[PDB]
Amino acid sequence: STGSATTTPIDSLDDAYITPVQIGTPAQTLNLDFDTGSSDLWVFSSETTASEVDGQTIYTPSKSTTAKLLSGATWSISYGDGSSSSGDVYTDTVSVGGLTVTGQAVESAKKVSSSFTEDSTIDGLLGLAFSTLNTVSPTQQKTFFDNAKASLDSPVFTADLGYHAPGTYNFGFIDTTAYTGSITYTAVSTKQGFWEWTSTGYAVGSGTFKSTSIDGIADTGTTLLYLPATVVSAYWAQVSGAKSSSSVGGYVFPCSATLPSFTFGVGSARIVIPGDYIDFGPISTGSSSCFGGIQSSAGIGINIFGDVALKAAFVVFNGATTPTLGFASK
């Protein structure tokens, strides 16, 4: 089997991407944030505290003939940005782009934090990291990809995020028409539950590539690119008027600036992030100061190859017995 679904930016900055997911019988279609940095599939629902729902489409398990309550099960998650959610647990039939998993754990939110309530476009998350991070208790549950794996033509999914445009998540096959040149594969460590890999270095604009190991995670659920302070300083030093602002919360630059590209290494291959991808717009409405898309990971505890980096590539998440990551230009 295979599946193929279009993923769409939620706003004009590509702050996140949503992908339609069919849950239950008859299908209830919710738009979920596919997140390769977490491992819970959770949804706004008929059980979510009413005052914490603001425009989202909700899953109503009592209207699904295939929903089953996982007796006594609970879940509770906190994300790197400080957001959180919690609730109880159902299993139900879940389909993504034609690919169906029966008995998928669907985590129903009873409570969500303000940042989720305030985002009317995101009806929940679909986690695609390793199932060892799943937060269901007393028994951890498997991700959609883990459940689907044995049925897939090949044990892979791919992320092909668009810049200010729709993209694609594919399951079970590599679309050889979706990238230029070849895919370079690189080792993954699953020790922390993430798609964790080591980049071979970086370049700023037309600068000579610096060979240096940068351990980080491929995380479709994080907007920006977070890298060591040394690397990030070297980047913004090439932008006139750029500075790190403690009040804004990161590097900012004059909106009139021409941003250099940023290159990261994948083995001996190179992925080039165009300068425009690094522009996340006015720091507030009407401001002539803009927020940068490359920020320091200092304080996070890990480097994160988020959407800013991933949308510059066709990315293979290879869930073979020994997982790997593949990157191609496109």
Side-chain angles (χ1 to χ4, degrees), residues 85-109 112-140:
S85 53
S86 64
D88 47 27
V89 185
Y90 292 81
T91 57
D92 210 338
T93 301
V94 172
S95 297
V96 175
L99 172 67
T100 300
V101 169
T102 55
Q104 173 65 45
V106 176
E107 298 169 38
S108 171
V112 304
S113 68
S114 67
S115 64
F116 285 115
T117 299
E118 290 163 359
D119 195 339
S120 74
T121 67
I122 290 174
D123 302 324
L125 266 64
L126 189 151
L128 289 166
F130 293 88
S131 293
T132 54
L133 293 177
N134 178 264
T135 75
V136 177
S137 171
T139 306
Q140 289 179 279

Coordinates of all heavy atoms in Angstrom, one line a residue, residues 85-140, unseen atoms left out:
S85 N -1.0 19.7 25.8 CA -2.4 19.2 25.7 C -2.5 17.9 26.4 O -1.4 17.3 26.7 CB -2.8 19.1 24.2 OG -1.8 18.4 23.5
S86 N -3.7 17.4 26.7 CA -3.9 16.2 27.5 C -5.3 15.7 27.3 O -6.2 16.4 26.9 CB -3.5 16.4 29.0 OG -4.4 17.3 29.6
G87 N -5.5 14.4 27.6 CA -6.8 13.8 27.5 C -6.9 12.3 27.7 O -6.1 11.7 28.4
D88 N -7.9 11.7 27.0 CA -8.0 10.2 27.1 C -7.8 9.7 25.7 O -7.4 10.4 24.8 CB -9.4 9.8 27.6 CG -10.6 10.6 27.0 OD1 -10.5 11.1 25.9 OD2 -11.6 10.7 27.7
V89 N -8.1 8.4 25.5 CA -7.6 7.7 24.3 C -8.6 6.8 23.7 O -9.2 6.0 24.3 CB -6.3 6.9 24.6 CG1 -5.7 6.3 23.3 CG2 -5.2 7.8 25.3
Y90 N -8.7 6.9 22.3 CA -9.6 6.1 21.5 C -8.7 5.4 20.5 O -7.6 5.8 20.3 CB -10.7 6.8 20.8 CG -11.7 7.4 21.7 CD1 -11.5 8.6 22.4 CD2 -12.9 6.7 22.0 CE1 -12.4 9.1 23.3 CE2 -13.9 7.2 22.8 CZ -13.6 8.4 23.5 OH -14.6 8.9 24.4
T91 N -9.1 4.3 20.0 CA -8.6 3.8 18.7 C -9.7 3.9 17.7 O -10.9 3.7 18.0 CB -8.1 2.3 18.8 OG1 -9.2 1.5 19.2 CG2 -6.9 2.2 19.8
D92 N -9.3 4.1 16.5 CA -10.2 4.3 15.4 C -9.5 4.1 14.1 O -8.2 4.1 14.0 CB -10.9 5.7 15.4 CG -12.3 5.7 14.9 OD1 -12.7 4.8 14.1 OD2 -13.1 6.6 15.2
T93 N -10.2 4.1 13.0 CA -9.7 4.0 11.7 C -9.2 5.3 11.2 O -10.0 6.3 11.2 CB -10.7 3.4 10.7 OG1 -11.1 2.1 11.2 CG2 -10.1 3.2 9.3
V94 N -7.9 5.4 10.8 CA -7.3 6.6 10.3 C -6.8 6.5 8.9 O -6.0 5.5 8.7 CB -6.2 7.1 11.3 CG1 -5.5 8.3 10.8 CG2 -6.8 7.4 12.7
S95 N -7.1 7.4 8.0 CA -6.6 7.3 6.7 C -5.9 8.6 6.3 O -6.4 9.7 6.6 CB -7.7 7.0 5.7 OG -8.3 5.8 5.9
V96 N -4.8 8.5 5.7 CA -4.0 9.6 5.2 C -3.8 9.4 3.7 O -3.1 8.5 3.3 CB -2.7 9.8 5.9 CG1 -1.8 10.9 5.4 CG2 -2.9 10.0 7.4
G97 N -4.3 10.3 2.8 CA -4.1 10.2 1.4 C -4.3 8.8 0.8 O -3.5 8.4 -0.1
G98 N -5.3 8.1 1.2 CA -5.6 6.8 0.7 C -5.1 5.6 1.5 O -5.5 4.5 1.2
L99 N -4.2 5.9 2.4 CA -3.5 4.8 3.2 C -4.3 4.7 4.5 O -4.5 5.7 5.3 CB -2.1 5.2 3.6 CG -1.3 4.3 4.6 CD1 -1.1 2.9 4.1 CD2 0.0 4.9 5.0
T100 N -4.8 3.5 4.8 CA -5.7 3.3 6.0 C -5.0 2.4 7.0 O -4.4 1.4 6.7 CB -7.0 2.6 5.6 OG1 -7.6 3.5 4.6 CG2 -7.9 2.4 6.8
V101 N -5.0 2.9 8.3 CA -4.6 2.1 9.5 C -5.9 1.9 10.3 O -6.6 2.8 10.7 CB -3.6 2.9 10.3 CG1 -3.3 2.2 11.6 CG2 -2.3 3.0 9.5
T102 N -6.2 0.6 10.6 CA -7.2 0.3 11.5 C -6.6 0.2 13.0 O -5.4 -0.2 13.1 CB -7.9 -1.0 11.2 OG1 -7.0 -2.1 11.1 CG2 -8.7 -0.8 9.9
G103 N -7.4 0.6 13.9 CA -7.0 0.5 15.3 C -5.9 1.5 15.7 O -5.1 1.3 16.7
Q104 N -5.8 2.6 15.0 CA -4.9 3.7 15.4 C -5.3 4.4 16.7 O -6.4 4.8 16.8 CB -4.8 4.7 14.2 CG -3.9 5.9 14.6 CD -2.5 5.6 14.8 OE1 -1.9 4.8 14.0 NE2 -1.9 6.1 15.8
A105 N -4.3 4.6 17.6 CA -4.6 5.4 18.8 C -4.8 6.8 18.4 O -3.9 7.5 17.7 CB -3.4 5.3 19.8
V106 N -6.0 7.3 18.7 CA -6.4 8.7 18.5 C -6.6 9.4 19.8 O -7.6 9.0 20.5 CB -7.7 8.8 17.6 CG1 -8.1 10.3 17.5 CG2 -7.4 8.2 16.2
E107 N -5.7 10.3 20.2 CA -5.7 10.8 21.5 C -6.6 12.0 21.5 O -6.4 13.0 20.8 CB -4.3 11.2 21.9 CG -3.4 9.9 21.9 CD -2.0 10.2 22.1 OE1 -1.6 11.2 22.8 OE2 -1.1 9.5 21.4
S108 N -7.7 11.9 22.3 CA -8.7 13.0 22.4 C -8.3 14.0 23.5 O -8.2 13.6 24.6 CB -10.1 12.3 22.7 OG -11.1 13.3 23.0
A109 N -8.2 15.3 23.1 CA -7.9 16.3 24.0 C -9.1 16.7 25.0 O -10.2 16.9 24.5 CB -7.4 17.5 23.3
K110 N -8.8 16.7 26.3 CA -9.7 17.3 27.2 C -9.3 18.7 27.5 O -10.1 19.6 27.8 CB -9.7 16.5 28.5 CG -10.3 15.1 28.4 CD -10.3 14.3 29.7
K111 N -8.0 18.9 27.4 CA -7.4 20.3 27.7 C -6.3 20.6 26.7 O -5.5 19.7 26.3 CB -6.8 20.3 29.1 CG -7.8 19.9 30.2
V112 N -6.3 21.8 26.2 CA -5.2 22.3 25.3 C -4.8 23.7 25.8 O -5.6 24.4 26.4 CB -5.7 22.4 23.8 CG1 -6.2 21.0 23.3 CG2 -6.7 23.4 23.6
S113 N -3.5 24.0 25.7 CA -3.0 25.3 26.1 C -3.4 26.4 25.1 O -3.9 26.1 24.0 CB -1.5 25.2 26.2 OG -0.9 25.1 24.9
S114 N -3.2 27.6 25.5 CA -3.7 28.8 24.7 C -3.2 28.8 23.3 O -4.0 29.2 22.4 CB -3.3 30.1 25.4 OG -1.9 30.3 25.4
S115 N -2.0 28.4 23.0 CA -1.5 28.5 21.7 C -2.2 27.6 20.7 O -2.3 27.9 19.5 CB 0.0 28.3 21.6 OG 0.3 26.9 22.0
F116 N -2.7 26.5 21.2 CA -3.5 25.6 20.4 C -4.9 26.2 20.1 O -5.4 26.2 19.0 CB -3.6 24.2 21.0 CG -2.3 23.4 20.8 CD1 -1.6 23.1 22.0 CD2 -1.9 23.1 19.6 CE1 -0.4 22.4 21.8 CE2 -0.7 22.4 19.5 CZ 0.0 22.0 20.6
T117 N -5.5 26.7 21.2 CA -6.9 27.3 21.1 C -6.8 28.5 20.1 O -7.7 28.6 19.3 CB -7.3 27.9 22.4 OG1 -7.4 26.8 23.4 CG2 -8.7 28.6 22.3
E118 N -5.8 29.3 20.1 CA -5.6 30.5 19.3 C -5.4 30.1 17.8 O -5.6 31.0 17.0 CB -4.5 31.4 19.9 CG -4.9 32.0 21.2 CD -3.8 32.5 22.0 OE1 -2.6 32.4 21.6 OE2 -4.0 33.1 23.1
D119 N -5.0 28.9 17.5 CA -4.8 28.5 16.2 C -5.9 27.7 15.6 O -6.0 26.5 15.7 CB -3.5 27.7 16.0 CG -3.1 27.6 14.6 OD1 -4.0 27.8 13.7 OD2 -1.9 27.4 14.3
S120 N -6.9 28.5 15.0 CA -8.1 27.9 14.5 C -7.9 26.9 13.3 O -8.7 26.1 13.0 CB -9.1 29.0 14.0 OG -8.6 29.6 12.8
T121 N -6.7 27.0 12.7 CA -6.4 26.2 11.5 C -5.9 24.8 11.8 O -5.9 23.9 10.9 CB -5.4 26.9 10.6 OG1 -4.1 26.9 11.3 CG2 -5.8 28.3 10.3
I122 N -5.5 24.5 13.0 CA -4.9 23.3 13.4 C -5.8 22.5 14.3 O -6.1 22.9 15.4 CB -3.5 23.5 14.0 CG1 -2.5 24.0 12.9 CG2 -3.0 22.2 14.6 CD1 -1.1 24.4 13.4
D123 N -6.3 21.4 13.8 CA -7.3 20.6 14.5 C -6.6 19.5 15.4 O -7.3 18.8 16.1 CB -8.2 19.9 13.6 CG -9.0 20.9 12.7 OD1 -9.3 22.0 13.1 OD2 -9.2 20.5 11.5
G124 N -5.3 19.4 15.3 CA -4.5 18.4 16.1 C -3.2 18.1 15.5 O -2.8 18.8 14.5
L125 N -2.5 17.2 16.0 CA -1.1 16.8 15.6 C -1.1 15.3 15.2 O -1.8 14.5 15.8 CB -0.1 17.1 16.7 CG 0.6 18.4 16.6 CD1 -0.4 19.6 16.8 CD2 1.7 18.5 17.6
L126 N -0.3 15.0 14.2 CA 0.0 13.6 13.9 C 1.5 13.4 14.0 O 2.2 13.9 13.1 CB -0.6 13.3 12.5 CG -0.5 11.8 12.2 CD1 -1.7 11.4 11.2 CD2 0.8 11.4 11.5
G127 N 1.9 12.7 15.0 CA 3.3 12.5 15.3 C 4.0 11.5 14.4 O 3.4 10.4 14.2
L128 N 5.2 11.8 14.0 CA 5.9 10.9 13.1 C 7.3 10.6 13.5 O 8.1 10.1 12.8 CB 5.9 11.5 11.7 CG 4.5 11.4 10.9 CD1 4.6 12.3 9.7 CD2 4.1 10.0 10.6
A129 N 7.6 11.0 14.8 CA 8.9 10.5 15.4 C 8.7 9.1 15.8 O 7.8 8.4 15.5 CB 9.3 11.4 16.6
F130 N 9.7 8.6 16.6 CA 9.6 7.2 17.0 C 8.7 6.9 18.1 O 8.5 7.8 19.0 CB 11.0 6.7 17.3 CG 11.9 6.6 16.0 CD1 12.6 7.8 15.6 CD2 11.9 5.5 15.2 CE1 13.3 7.8 14.5 CE2 12.6 5.5 14.0 CZ 13.3 6.7 13.6
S131 N 8.0 5.8 18.1 CA 6.9 5.5 19.1 C 7.3 5.5 20.5 O 6.5 5.6 21.4 CB 6.3 4.2 18.7 OG 5.6 4.3 17.4
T132 N 8.6 5.4 20.8 CA 9.2 5.5 22.1 C 8.9 6.8 22.8 O 9.1 6.9 24.0 CB 10.7 5.2 22.1 OG1 11.3 6.1 21.2 CG2 11.0 3.8 21.7
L133 N 8.5 7.9 22.1 CA 8.2 9.2 22.7 C 6.7 9.3 22.9 O 6.3 10.3 23.5 CB 8.6 10.3 21.8 CG 10.2 10.5 21.6 CD1 10.5 11.6 20.7 CD2 10.8 10.8 23.0
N134 N 5.9 8.3 22.5 CA 4.5 8.4 22.7 C 4.1 8.5 24.2 O 4.7 7.8 25.0 CB 3.7 7.2 22.1 CG 2.3 7.3 22.3 OD1 1.7 6.7 23.2 ND2 1.6 8.1 21.4
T135 N 3.2 9.4 24.5 CA 2.9 9.7 25.9 C 1.7 9.0 26.5 O 1.4 9.2 27.7 CB 2.7 11.2 26.2 OG1 1.4 11.6 25.7 CG2 3.7 12.1 25.5
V136 N 1.1 8.1 25.8 CA -0.1 7.4 26.4 C 0.4 6.5 27.6 O 1.5 5.9 27.5 CB -0.8 6.6 25.3 CG1 -2.0 5.8 26.0 CG2 -1.3 7.5 24.2
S137 N -0.4 6.5 28.6 CA -0.2 5.7 29.8 C -1.5 5.0 30.1 O -2.5 5.6 29.9 CB 0.3 6.7 30.9 OG 0.3 6.0 32.2
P138 N -1.4 3.8 30.6 CA -0.2 3.0 31.1 C 0.6 2.4 30.0 O 1.8 2.0 30.3 CB -0.8 2.0 32.1 CG -2.1 1.7 31.5 CD -2.6 3.0 31.0
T139 N 0.0 2.2 28.8 CA 0.8 1.5 27.8 C 0.9 2.4 26.6 O 0.0 3.0 26.0 CB 0.0 0.2 27.3 OG1 -0.3 -0.6 28.4 CG2 0.8 -0.5 26.2
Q140 N 2.2 2.6 26.2 CA 2.5 3.5 25.0 C 1.9 2.9 23.8 O 1.8 1.7 23.6 CB 4.0 3.7 24.8 CG 4.6 4.5 25.9 CD 6.1 4.6 25.6 OE1 6.9 3.7 26.0 NE2 6.5 5.7 25.0

